[PDB]
Amino acid sequence: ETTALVCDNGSGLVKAGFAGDDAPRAVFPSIVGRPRHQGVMVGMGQKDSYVGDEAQSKRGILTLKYPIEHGIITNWDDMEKIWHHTFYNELRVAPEEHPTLLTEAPLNPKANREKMTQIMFETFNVPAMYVAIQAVLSLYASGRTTGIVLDSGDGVTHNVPIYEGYALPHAIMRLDLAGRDLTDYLMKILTERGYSFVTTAEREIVRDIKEKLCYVALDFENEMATAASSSSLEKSYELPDGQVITIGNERFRCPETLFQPSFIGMESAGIHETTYNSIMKCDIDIRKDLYANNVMSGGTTMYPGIADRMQKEITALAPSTMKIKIIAPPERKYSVWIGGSILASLSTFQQMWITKQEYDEAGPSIVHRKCF
Amino acid sequence: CDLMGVDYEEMAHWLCHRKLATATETYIKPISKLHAINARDALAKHIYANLFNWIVDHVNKALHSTVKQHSF
Amino acid sequence: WXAXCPA
Amino acid sequence: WXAXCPA
Amino acid sequence: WXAXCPA
């Protein structure tokens, strides 16, 4: 009949699809390119801007911009280009026919939701929509009603404790560390070894290096002692021009800055200490049930060994007599989408949508009272 | 597996794991004992319902006649 | 952002 | 250098 | 503190 669209804007990848199917059928980077060189050949069909995988294919000749930075949409016309491309090109569905479900990080400005709703109603003319919290959807995705979700995409990291379906909004922690600034750190440490990656395309090469070769050390000092004392840890990667580059302690040393943000120069504690300091803000009767479920979400939690490092140092911080259990399903990169796909298909949820009648009556202000 | 002519190792793997595929990328992941039991019983029900529809279609092949039916 | 961070 | 730039 | 609150 009619099936809601489910869209998660993220930073980096857009992933989108229809409610009640199990994985997104559109996935592509939320990136817009504009050509920067003088075009020479007449009659080429040359185009004003490129979106998604087009801008990845041609990225040699493009300036690449991300329209979302730390979960805040900074540039709105490019975000409208990304949604226009998503609905018409990727899904090939007319948005007037389908409710749309949209996903956001907690504690980000309200103007972002007001503009997202004004755009979805006025330009797209979407009949109904909703804005959902990224972390809440990872519980729907992992089959739980209780747990402290740790979520990290590109941009924002946040912890959200939930207990039997009640959020605890005073205990929500948010951190801007994750994912892009790891790449801007890797580009800085790789220069030490004599490699220089400046352009926005070279940043995409370093992002691919990070996704292939980085891993998290169980003990950071033992492994720096080992990699100073050996070649055994060292891996080599082939650049798109067929050069070959060799990467040593940098590969474990890059994601350690998740646990020691002072490397990039932040003043806040690592994700393990924001997790523990988030559990410490919950009332003592429920802490046992948060230690028994920790749910990792989003791509920045994909590094090998990040679960066992998290469990090791949280088990160091926690009182000795409790199970600490870290839950990290291999699919977790899509968990926020799978959770929104579940949520949008419930029958109880069909009264939750903001309808255009209500937007017309109350204006975009309504989103704050109706949505979370 | 002997009765049904399948590789023991493939039924033993797929009974306990389920597979999800994004358009570029596929993940195999385990499932709990409850989901494994629910899926075995859904397989048994799906086999039975298809065998039933098959016996009904082979009865219909015996009952049909070639003259075009004007009305019934 | 509008103050603390760049976005 | 050894990758990006020529030196 | 020592039990309830953090200090």
Ligand SMILES: Nc1ncnc2c1ncn2[C@@H]1O[C@H](COP(=O)(O)OP(=O)(O)O)[C@@H](O)[C@H]1O
């Ligand atoms: N296998 C991987 N290992 C390490 N990092 C990854 C991996 N896959 C993606 N990433 C990084 O995680 C970020 C993408 O995560 P994602 O969940 O898609 O972001 P968002 O939630 O904003 O859509 C990017 O910075 C990307 O480089």
Ligand SMILES: [Mg+2]
């Ligand atoms: Mg996300």
